[PDB]
Ligand binder design. Structure first.
Ligand code: V81
Length: 828
């Protein structure tokens, strides 16, 4: 009771929003969701293994790729066991477990000892072979020794959870639905009218506009908008979308007609409306505008066996199922899908198109859809198609049972795969009608089960709460629900992290107020010293990479980055002892820009890598951690031994072909290291040429493109033209110019086609991730989404796609420096 208020105030600090507050509400759905999420939390906390939770072994049941088998010498992975300034190497095979390795060590000079990684809080533990650990695969990929420290396991009592102290709609009639629009109000384009839509999954079932009156401070209509749809006909999660036009949309607000308790909405509502800045995720929100003083408001009143198909039609049905998600279904396609629904149900890929064809505004039709969803032996037995699963969780589907079967397929995901899709799955909670949902419980459950997922779950939820008024109320209830079962050790760790972000965001606002200058470098090193002496914690877990513990600031190494945005080049000491080297943990702390759009671009690029792993292609674009920490701010990994090619080129806008290759000659001393860097350049450049072409972000200036000393190319910014950057300086490194060819350029083409075709095998997955980004990330249009189809070349064989992408390579070679030079013209 007394201490619970302090614990509640502790949660509010971590969450960044007061869940107990009821200023911006008209119902108890948020409070019901807090109470509702008690059951899945305590079940998941009870079911989880205490030992494996504390140690959190990051593993994958996927196969090891062909390129990583060639890194293994003679079926023998070298693993070095360290123990208080004494190291010993062991001959261990890929199929051996940690338990087998422990027995092998303890033979040559027992139960209460575990193999922790050197430097990181990462544990080689549990009934899993040594190749399946993701740290072991990272060491073999990058070409580094697997250094391991022998020590006692962490205590599960540190992860203790506290004691927590806590179908048909009623008034069913055959009458038509109506709403009285009383009027509107605002304190601070000379005509307006209210448009009352009845939406269900971005689909207007009925629409009734008011009469056009003049745009004054208080416009009062006082009129029943009588619709032609019954009360029984209203489906669950039906959305009363109220909008104010003037041709020109000004304001909007939504209201759920059927509530969380299966009851129809009634009584007086003065809903405070969101202002506009086409369709997006913010358009769908049940939350009202919290800023009640300035915002627009709207006052309302609510008061109340089977035969075989023909061969033509089966071919016609299979033709409809074969098309992509963005291919629009006609009225003829929907009627065919519905009439032959039991044949459509035998194909899993039909499901998005089938449940799009449902007439959700008829109660009898929804009942048949539920009867159809009952017997789904094919869907349950099918292999996990994540792209197909992601379709059913987008804006087009509002039914709980349709969305629940998608979430059911997500249950079979391993923890490694959940991390790849976690950001997008957290963004997919915006498309839910209700606060409590199957997806919300899935994210909670898998967050509570694994520490790594739960770490990134915290930051994805906390970032949205900060920079989105539309969905902060939903995410705070989910985040509170995670934090109430994550454990005391993690609660302590998240507090230490938030304190570092809070202090650094306080420091960074003052620096931007005060181009490079003498005072700016001194004032930063002043402020970083002041916090470090007392207030700043002794250590903290790195948000983008929770294995690393960053300690105290190396304030001599700290600086402000010389740009317009002025990000903070911070540099921390490694807190955990027994590290390999004495290299500092470098962190760029970004501020000012909205990172939400760019965070989702990055996560797709990480999904593109995992596609290229499954078909044996080692491109490895994007070699740095990056994460959004709050409102307009973020935290990014520094790559040691790396610079921008604009710095390399000029060492006014005069470019050079030879200079980039001479830079690689300088930094890599030997010819084997040089040819490795030329090879790594060919693989990475081919990855970026393919990836940016698909996403439509290839035309770019060279100041935001970087290259490591090891040859690995990477990008630090995302958006008479070129489809991607393949300039003469890049082509020179391969060994060609103008109208010539070479072994590396031929290899670049072979890698480009293989990588491009590899992405085409997951066309539907990439389409929906691209579609979900533009709605959830950006505060868009159908035509913006339709580019990726043309970029992927949908409905064309591998020879035509090869010919298509090879032509786009030749476009870059003809123009060359024209696009890069045009930045200097357009600069002036
Ligand atoms: C897309 C967005 C994302 C939403 C945040 N991103 C990603 C990103 C990466 C890096 C980066 C990452 C590793 N390294 N390693 C380095 N050595 C550098 C280095 C040395 N000098 N410069 C000039 C760079 C670096 N920069 C820097 C930036 C910056 F522009 F904010 F500063 C952003 C940035 O805004």
């Amino acid at each position: 009771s007394e201490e619970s208020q302090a614990f509640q105030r502790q949660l509010t600090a971590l969450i960044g929003y007061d869940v107990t507050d009821v200023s911006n509400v008209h119902d108890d759905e948020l409070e019901f969701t807090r109470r509702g999420l008690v059951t899945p939390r305590m079940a998941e906390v009870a079911s989880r293994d205490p030992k494996l939770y504390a140690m959190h072994p990051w593993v994958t049941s996927k196969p090891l790729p062909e390129y990583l088998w060639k890194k293994i010498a003679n079926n023998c992975i070298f693993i070095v066991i360290h123990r208080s300034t004494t190291s010993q190497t062991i001959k261990v095979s890929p199929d051996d477990t940690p338990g087998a390795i422990l027995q092998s060590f303890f033979t040559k000079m027992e139960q209460d000892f575990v193999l922790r990684v050197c430097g990181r809080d990462e544990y080689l533990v549990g009934e899993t072979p040594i190749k399946n650990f993701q740290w072991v695969r990272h060491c073999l990929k990058n070409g580094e020794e697997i250094h391991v420290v022998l020590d006692t396991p962490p205590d599960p009592a540190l992860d203790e959870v506290r004691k927590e102290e806590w179908t048909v709609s009623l008034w069913d009639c055959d009458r038509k639905f109506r709403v009285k629009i009383r009027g509107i109000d605002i304190p601070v384009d000379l005509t307006v009218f209210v448009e009352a839509n009845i939406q269900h999954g971005q689909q207007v079932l009925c629409q009734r506009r008011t009469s056009p009156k003049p745009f004054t401070e208080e416009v009062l209509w006082n009129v029943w908008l009588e619709f032609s749809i019954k009360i029984k006909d209203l489906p669950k999660g039906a959305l009363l979308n109220l909008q104010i036009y003037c041709v020109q949309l000004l304001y909007y607000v939504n209201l759920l007609l059927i509530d969380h308790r299966f009851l129809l909405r009634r009584g007086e509502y003065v809903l405070h409306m969101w202002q506009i800045s086409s369709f997006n995720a913010d358009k769908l929100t049940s939350a009202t505008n919290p800023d009640k003083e300035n915002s627009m408001s709207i006052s309302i009143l609510l008061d109340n066996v089977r035969a075989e198909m023909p061969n033509q039609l089966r071919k016609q049905l299979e033709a409809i199922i074969a098309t992509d998600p963005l291919n629009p279904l006609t009225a003829e396609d929907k009627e065919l899908l519905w009439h032959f629904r039991y044949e459509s149900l035998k194909h899993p890929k039909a499901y998005p198109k089938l449940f799009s064809s449902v007439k959700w505004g008829q109660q009898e039709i929804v009942a048949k859809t539920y009867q159809l969803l009952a017997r789904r032996e094919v869907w349950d037995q099918s292999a996990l198609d994540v792209g197909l699963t992601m379709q059913l969780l987008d804006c087009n589907f509002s039914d709980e049972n349709v969305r629940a079967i998608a979430v059911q397929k997500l249950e079979s995901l391993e923890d490694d795969d959940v991390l790849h899709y976690l950001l997008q799955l957290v963004q997919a909670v915006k498309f839910e009608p209700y606060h409590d949902s199957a997806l919300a419980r899935f994210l909670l459950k898998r967050g509570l089960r694994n520490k790594r997922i739960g770490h990134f779950l915290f930051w994805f939820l906390r970032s949205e709460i900060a920079q989105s008024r539309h969905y902060q109320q939903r995410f705070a209830v989910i985040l509170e629900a995670y934090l109430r079962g994550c454990g005391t050790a993690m609660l302590h760790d998240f507090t230490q992290q938030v304190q570092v972000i809070e202090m650094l965001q306080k420091v960074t606002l003052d620096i931007k107020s005060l181009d490079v200058s003498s005072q700016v470098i001194s004032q930063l090193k002043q402020k970083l010293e002041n916090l470090q002496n007392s207030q700043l914690p002794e250590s903290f877990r790195v948000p983008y990479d929770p294995g690393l513990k960053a300690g105290a600031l190396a304030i001599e190494k700290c600086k402000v980055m010389a740009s317009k945005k002025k990000p903070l080049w911070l540099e921390f000491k490694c807190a955990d002892p027994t590290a390999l080297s004495n290299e500092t943990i470098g962190i760029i702390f970004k501020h000012g820009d909205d990172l939400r759009q760019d965070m989702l671009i990055l996560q797709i690029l990480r999904i593109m890598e995992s596609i290229w792993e499954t078909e044996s292609l080692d491109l490895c674009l994007l070699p740095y951690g990056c994460i959004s920490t709050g409102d307009k701010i973020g935290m990014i990994e520094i790559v040691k031994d790396a610079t921008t090619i604009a710095k390399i080129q000029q060492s006014t806008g005069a470019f050079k072909d030879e200079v980039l290759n001479h830079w690689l000659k300088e930094k890599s001393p030997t010819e084997e290291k040089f040819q490795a860097a030329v090879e790594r350049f060919v693989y990475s450049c081919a990855g970026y040429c393919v990836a940016t072409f698909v996403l439509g972000i290839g035309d770019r200036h060279n100041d935001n493109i970087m290259i490591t000393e090891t040859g690995n190319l990477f990008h630090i910014d995302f958006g008479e033209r070129v489809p991607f950057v393949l300039t003469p300086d890049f082509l020179f490194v391969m060994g060609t110019s103008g109208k010539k060819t070479s072994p590396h350029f031929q290899k670049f083409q072979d890698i480009c086609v293989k990588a491009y075709l590899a992405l085409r095998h997951h066309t539907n997955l990439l389409i929906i991730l691209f579609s979900m980004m533009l709605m959830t990330g950006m505060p868009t249009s159908k035509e913006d989404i339709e580019y990726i189809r043309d970029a992927l070349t949908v409905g064309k064989n591998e020879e035509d796609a090869k010919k298509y992408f090879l032509d786009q390579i030749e476009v870059c070679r003809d123009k060359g420096w024209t696009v890069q030079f045009n930045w200097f013209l357009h600069l002036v």
